[PDB]
Design a protein around this nucleic acid. Sequence first.
RNA 1: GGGCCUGUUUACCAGGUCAGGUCCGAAAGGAAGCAGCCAAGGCAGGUCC
Length: 69
Amino acid sequence: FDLNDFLEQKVLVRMEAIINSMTMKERAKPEIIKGSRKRRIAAGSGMQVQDVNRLLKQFDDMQRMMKKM
RNA sequence: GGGCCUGUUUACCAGGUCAGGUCCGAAAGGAAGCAGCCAAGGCAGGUCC
């Protein structure tokens, strides 16, 4: 399960805008989505970093349920 | 090293185009733009100078 599968799954519109701003590698391994990258992603999808951060936490929450389902 | 070619590589760090999204506007419409791709660069090879 990754930022892609999670993408498979209104405010949802922006759940995209964000992910749509990433790289196949980021989607393939979020555990590297640091500040520099974040900052990029936020402005990428006209969001605030804390928006990205949240979306990271959200998927995080599910990735969890996945790594324990 | 240069030209041409091919393989490969390259998140943002004044290239181009920008799906998605965002911004300003009552509207009409403007603007900045991530990923992609294009291009450019890196690493090699083939080839010609």
